[PDB]
Amino acid sequence: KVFGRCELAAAMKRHGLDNYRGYSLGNWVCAAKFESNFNTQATNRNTDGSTDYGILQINSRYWCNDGRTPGSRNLCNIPCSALLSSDITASVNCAKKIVSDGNGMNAWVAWRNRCKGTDVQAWIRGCRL
Numbered sequence: 001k002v003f004g005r006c007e008l009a010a011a012m013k014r015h016g017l018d019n020y021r022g023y024s025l026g027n028w029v030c031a032a033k034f035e036s037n038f039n040t041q042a043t044n045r046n047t048d049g050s051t052d053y054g055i056l057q058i059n060s061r062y063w064c065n066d067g068r069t070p071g072s073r074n075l076c077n078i079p080c081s082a083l084l085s086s087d088i089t090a091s092v093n094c095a096k097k098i099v100s101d102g103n104g105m106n107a108w109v110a111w112r113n114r115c116k117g118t119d120v121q122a123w124i125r126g127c128r129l
């Protein structure tokens with residue numbers, strides 16, 4: 001599913017991401033925009049053989065099981081395919097664990113390079129929240 005900007009903001013808010021760990025909703029929508037362009041089915045391969053899945057581009061090296069990333073962890077306790085769903089629940093629960101891991105949103109490279117320190121409020125302009 002490709003989400004609309006405001007559509008994703010509502011689901012995210014609903015799922016408790018607004019100010020989760022001190023990160024305003026803007027931050028989360030910006031991250032989704034740059035990581036997958038709001039596409040739940042985005043997948044990308046990394047050089048170490050791990051894969052990034054879904055809307056938040058969650059990595060198999062640490063967070064999910066894809067049966068093909070030898071000696072990686074499955075910290076969110078889910079098959080990576082659960083992250084590709086139209087329903088963002090699994091992606092959001094998993095995100096919550098990632099962001100609390102110590103590096104905050106720096107875990108997301110597109111956030112760090114394109115969202116961090118920008119006027120993230122713009123991402124939710126005109127949404128009915």
Ligand SMILES: CC(=O)N[C@@H]1[C@@H](O)[C@H](O[C@@H]2O[C@H](CO)[C@@H](O[C@@H]3O[C@H](CO)[C@@H](O[C@@H]4O[C@H](CO)[C@@H](O)[C@H](O)[C@H]4NC(C)=O)[C@H](O)[C@H]3NC(C)=O)[C@H](O)[C@H]2NC(C)=O)[C@@H](CO)O[C@H]1O
Nearest residue numbers: 035046052056057058059062098101102103107108109110
């Ligand atoms: C080429 C490229 O950059 N591709 C992108 C993917 O790499 C990226 O996925 C992210 O991958 C990074 C790389 O390591 C990963 O970051 C690691 O995360 C673990 C888990 O949190 C860290 O280990 C923790 O360290 C903290 C603080 O040091 C400790 O408090 C804690 O004990 C550690 N936890 C565990 C379980 O070990 C690493 O510190 C950290 N490594 C680095 C180098 O920063 C991110 O978690 C991945 N992000 C996500 C969302 O999965 C992918 C996602 O955007 O994007 C590719 O393009």
